[PDB]
Design a protein around this ligand. Structure first.
Ligand code: NAI
Ligand code: FMN
Ligand code: SF4
Ligand code: SF4
Ligand code: SF4
Ligand code: FES
Ligand code: FES
Ligand code: K
Lengths: 44, 213, 430, 230
């Protein structure tokens, strides 16, 4: 049934204060290896 | 609004602060999100993470963030003083921010302001005696078609009248969580006099794809 | 074609703008998103750049630079450093809320636009700098990014094309000056959000010293639709150098403030009368309209009758299009109070690096407060004008121009109102 | 040879690639006024005094940071260059305190000298000035931050030469203060040299304070014997 009268963005009522960081931590296992500049720090 | 720090027993470098181990794992993920050799970028999220440990920043999270990322503490002080979303003073549990820019001023956000001030018995920048509310005045928060609007913690309460913000305050005092949405009939951004556009159902895939693709 | 406006629902790119349909992967996939992306990735960067420079799409951030050329200086062979595409999702400008709805309701469109753009310039990864206050939108974008990562659309072997691409979400910390592209680049790197000096342009030295292209959400989310439907389809709307569709946020003293997409060269009166439901108290109750938020100068009712809302017809009308954010003030508004509030906003959002803005915006705030109180003389007014002429063009970033323009517009259009206010103060208190 | 041709006030001169406008004008012989620029520090460009005009171009460019290209004619004495200088220095002197008689920098102040040279002759500022809270950084450098113009030679000297990384800017806007944010002493080998490279009287020498005046002191060129550097 095509419903054009209900707001479908209802998930954001359930978000806590640690939702974004936990989502990043769960996503971090799918990421590429980061390129390196050849040094630990610019002050190194 | 003082940008210099004086050492107090409440806010001293020997104030106890340390991240939880789950926050250590989150900090490690934040650091791994950035290129090697540029760990200092992780100053921006992790310090905010420290705020989510306390709700405010004493000068012990700044030194800890500087220590775990090999940056001088003055850079962390610069980051914490440049941005306005980092609380360097102990704010209440429910931090209320009222937008009073011109697209919100035209729709009478000052009415919301005096209603909140009359209800809570406090002024702008003043904390409640029971440390439950803290009312300040901020700039535009990017929901100007839903004017007037306020932000409580990380939630947006938009298109309010004085009655709705009174109801929101009484619901916050009771311990319940109100729904972060507009208090009028509309949901997100549609006109109140019915949907003027986007009434047609979506076409779906394969529509308008040019040849040779 | 000469008559523009009244855009049909078939040609609107931003379906599910109002959020009535599903915002997740399955809801977006049944609307046209993520369809034949691997064909575009295999056709490659030259074809994508040609298809986005054939459409005549300009920068929807507010400067109107051509998107094809701006994405074309970055296309160059590598010198050992990676390439990056960064999406400006700040919208600290008052009146503008379109990209908030784009991110919250159509995040997969933004991710597909990031993938197509990063294929166009050979970018290694994508950085999305969302606003600090937009926690729920950031979480929605992260959920959509994880859903696209799970299906193999991005990450390892993106969309079955052999190309490597990533997406990162970096939350802000509540700064308007971080919306500037060089200040955004500096704020990604963990420093204070202070803009750099061009040259070097970000196409040569950008984030972490790597080649970088900073693009708005609105001009990124429409790139797959341009590359799929065709450049001529996007160029069939509006005037020449005014092609495409634009999102307008109409607010202020209107009956129904709303965000609506429209043809790029729609008349202002038709847009206000049709979508916003009309000005409060009728059309004859109009006093002033700000076409593109606090950066662009205001225009009175005499010009708003026969004006077109594109780039050329607004630069010719001694103002700018900006972000296409309509702020409407009727006869029951104090214009001087509104401009004073705008200058107070500009002095509360100013990085303070370079001298002319750091001193002159505070000077303009004090002078405008005295104007609102009326404790001033007419001979100061032109002096205030000269203050703006000492700020515009002498600053690092364009916040100085964006602060000098409203004062110049208000003075040039309502000098008699200011003079009446100060002479009333003089004849009353003295 | 990779030397390219540029013009300063119509006079042709050879420059190396990567040369700034300021260095080319110095090679011709013109000294463009500057506040934040230093030949031994990194280019910051946050004072906008060096705004010089390139002909056939509708904008002034920062001569301390703009790299020259071929065919450029630099107008160091045109009308809009002087207008930009006067506006920038009017903004600079809008919030400066009236501390000249009680200042150790008086008589050798860069701000006074280029105010007489390139500045205007009167002030249109009819508002209230700011007042920055003072700081303590040791018994060597006397700090009066009401007179600082936020030139950021402090930060660049302490970050690139002294290597302390303990000086910075806290704030955003007209209330941005150059300091240390805590009661920290700026003790270093070269901690006095900031007094040399402060264009205003914000950082003065505490032992020398309130003792003499630069116009009545005889200068004798001599050699240090304190160490073996000479
Ligand atoms: N969307 C928003 O939230 C806001 C928008 N604005 C609008 O944005 C504009 C000001 O922004 P700017 O970025 O300073 O405008 P514009 O001067 O800089 O330049 C636009 C883009 O073109 C690039 N560009 C220009 N010349 C180039 C060249 N020769 N080579 C390579 N790249 C080049 C710049 O790097 C930049 O990314 C104004 O129109 C203002 O109204 C202002 C405030 C907020
Ligand atoms: C003070 C200031 C704030 C800005 N804020 C934004 C912003 O929030 N969002 C945006 O897309 N562009 C903003 N811009 C414009 C950017 O400089 C630039 O146009 C944008 O990052 C990309 O524009 P484009 O669409 O032409 O690629 C701002 C510019 C200035 C001077
Ligand atoms: S114009 Fe203002 S906000 Fe922009 S760089 Fe200069 S001081 Fe910073
Ligand atoms: S620093 Fe210069 S301009 Fe300022 S009070 Fe001292 S002598 Fe006067
Ligand atoms: S104290 Fe002097 S040297 Fe330091 S930033 Fe201020 S003006 Fe520059
Ligand atoms: S003006 Fe209040 S949300 Fe933008
Ligand atoms: S000397 Fe060039 S901007 Fe200061
Ligand atoms: K000095």
């Amino acid at each position: 049934p095509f419903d054009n009268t209900t707001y479908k963005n209802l998930q954001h009522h359930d978000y806590s204060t640690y939702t974004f960081l936990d989502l990043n931590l769960d996503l971090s296992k799918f990421r590429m290896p980061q390129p390196s500049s050849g040094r630990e720090s610019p002050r190194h | 609004a003082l940008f210099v720090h004086r050492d107090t027993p409440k806010n001293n470098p020997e104030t106890p602060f340390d991240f939880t181990p789950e926050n250590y794992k989150r900090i490690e993920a934040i650091v791994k999100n950035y290129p090697e050799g540029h760990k200092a970028a992780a100053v921006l999220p992790v310090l905010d993470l420290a705020q989510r440990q306390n709700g405010w920043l004493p000068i012990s999270a700044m030194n800890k963030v500087a220590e775990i990322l090999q940056v001088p503490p003055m850079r962390v002080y610069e980051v914490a003083t440049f941005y306005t979303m980092y609380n360097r003073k102990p704010v209440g549990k429910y931090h209320i921010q009222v937008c009073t820019t011109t697209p919100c001023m035209l729709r009478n956000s000052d009415s919301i302001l005096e209603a909140i001030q009359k209800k809570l018995g406090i002024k702008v920048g003043e904390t409640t005696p029971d440390k439950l509310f803290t009312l300040i005045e901020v700039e535009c928060l990017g929901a100007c078609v839903n004017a007037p609007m306020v932000q409580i913690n990380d939630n947006y309460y938009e298109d309010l009248t004085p009655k709705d913000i009174e109801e929101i305050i009484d619901e916050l005092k009771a311990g319940k969580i109100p729904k972060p949405g507009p208090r009028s009939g509309r949901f997100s951004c549609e006109p109140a006099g019915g949907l003027t556009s986007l009434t047609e159902p979506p076409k779906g895939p394969g529509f308008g794809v040019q040849a040779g693709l | 074609k000469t008559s523009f406006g009244s855009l049909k629902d078939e040609d609107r790119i931003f379906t599910n703008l109002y959020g009535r349909h599903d915002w997740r992967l399955k809801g977006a996939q049944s609307r046209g998103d993520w369809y034949k992306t691997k064909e575009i990735l295999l056709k490659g960067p030259d074809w994508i750049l040609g298809e986005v420079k054939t459409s005549g799409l300009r920068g929807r951030g507010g400067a109107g630079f051509p998107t094809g050329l701006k994405w074309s200086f970055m296309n160059k062979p590598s010198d050992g450093r990676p390439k990056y595409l960064v999406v400006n999702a700040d919208e600290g400008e008052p009146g503008t809320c379109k990209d908030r709805e784009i991110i919250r309701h159509d995040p997969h469109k933004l991710v597909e636009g990031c993938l197509v753009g990063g294929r166009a310039m050979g970018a290694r990864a994508a950085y999305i700098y969302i606003r600090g206050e937009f926690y729920n939108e950031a979480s929605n974008l992260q959920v959509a990014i994880r859903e696209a990562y799970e299906a193999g659309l991005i990450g390892k072997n993106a969309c079955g094309s052999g190309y490597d691409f990533d997406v990162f979400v970096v939350r802000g910390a509540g700064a308007y000056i971080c919306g500037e592209e060089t200040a955004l680049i500096e704020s990604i790197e963990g420093k204070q959000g202070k803009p750099r000096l061009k040259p070097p342009f970000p196409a040569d030295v950008g984030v972490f010293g790597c080649p970088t292209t900073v693009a708005n959400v609105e001009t990124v989310a429409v790139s797959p639709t341009i590359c799929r439907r065709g450049g001529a389809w996007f160029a069939s709307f509006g005037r020449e150098r005014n092609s495409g569709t634009k999102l307008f946020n109409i607010s202020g003293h209107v009956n129904n403030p709303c965000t609506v997409e429209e043809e790029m060269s729609v008349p202002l009166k038709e847009l206000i009368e049709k979508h916003a439901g009309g000005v409060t108290g009728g059309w004859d109750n109009l006093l002033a309209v700000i076409p593109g938020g606090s950066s662009t100068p205001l225009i009175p009712k005499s010009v708003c009758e026969t004006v077109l809302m594109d780039f050329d017809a607004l630069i010719q009308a001694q103002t700018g299009l900006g972000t296409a954010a309509v702020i409407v003030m009727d006869r029951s508004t104090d214009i001087v109070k509104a401009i004073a509030r705008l200058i107070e906003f500009y002095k509360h959002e100013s990085c303070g690096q370079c001298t002319p803005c750091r001193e002159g915006v505070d000077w303009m705030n004090k002078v405008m407060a005295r104007f609102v109180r009326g404790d001033a003389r007419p001979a100061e007014i032109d002096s205030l004008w000269e203050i703006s002429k000492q700020i515009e063009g002498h600053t690092i970033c364009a916040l100085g121009d964006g602060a000098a323009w409203p004062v110049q517009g208000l003075i040039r259009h309502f000098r008699p109102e200011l003079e009446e206010r100060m002479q009333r103060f003089a004849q009353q208190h003295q | 040879s990779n030397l390219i041709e540029v013009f300063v006030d119509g006079q042709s001169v050879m420059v190396e690639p990567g040369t700034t406008v300021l260095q080319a004008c110095e090679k011709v012989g013109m000294q463009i006024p500057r506040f934040c620029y230093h030949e031994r520090l990194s280019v910051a460009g946050n004072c906008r005094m060096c705004l010089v005009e390139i002909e056939k171009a509708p904008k002034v460019v920062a001569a301390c940071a703009m790299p020259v290209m071929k065919g450029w004619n630099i107008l160091t004495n045109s009308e809009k260059t002087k207008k930009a200088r006067e506006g920038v220095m009017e903004f600079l002197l809008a919030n400066h305190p009236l501390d000249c008689p009680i200042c150790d920098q008086g008589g050798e102040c860069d701000l006074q000298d280029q105010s007489m040279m390139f500045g205007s002759d009167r002030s249109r500022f009819l508002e209230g000035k700011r007042a920055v809270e003072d700081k303590n950084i040791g018994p060597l450098v006397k700090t009066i931050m009401t007179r600082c113009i936020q030139c950021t030679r402090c930060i660049r000297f302490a970050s690139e030469i002294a290597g302390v990384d303990d000086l910075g800017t806290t704030g955003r806007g007209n209330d941005m203060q150059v300091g240390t944010y805590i009661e920290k002493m700026f003790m270093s080998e070269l901690s006095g040299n900031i007094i040399d490279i402060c264009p205003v009287g914000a950082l003065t020498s505490k032992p020398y304070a309130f003792t003499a005046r630069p116009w009545e002191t005889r200068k004798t060129e001599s050699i240090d014997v304190m160490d073996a550097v000479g």
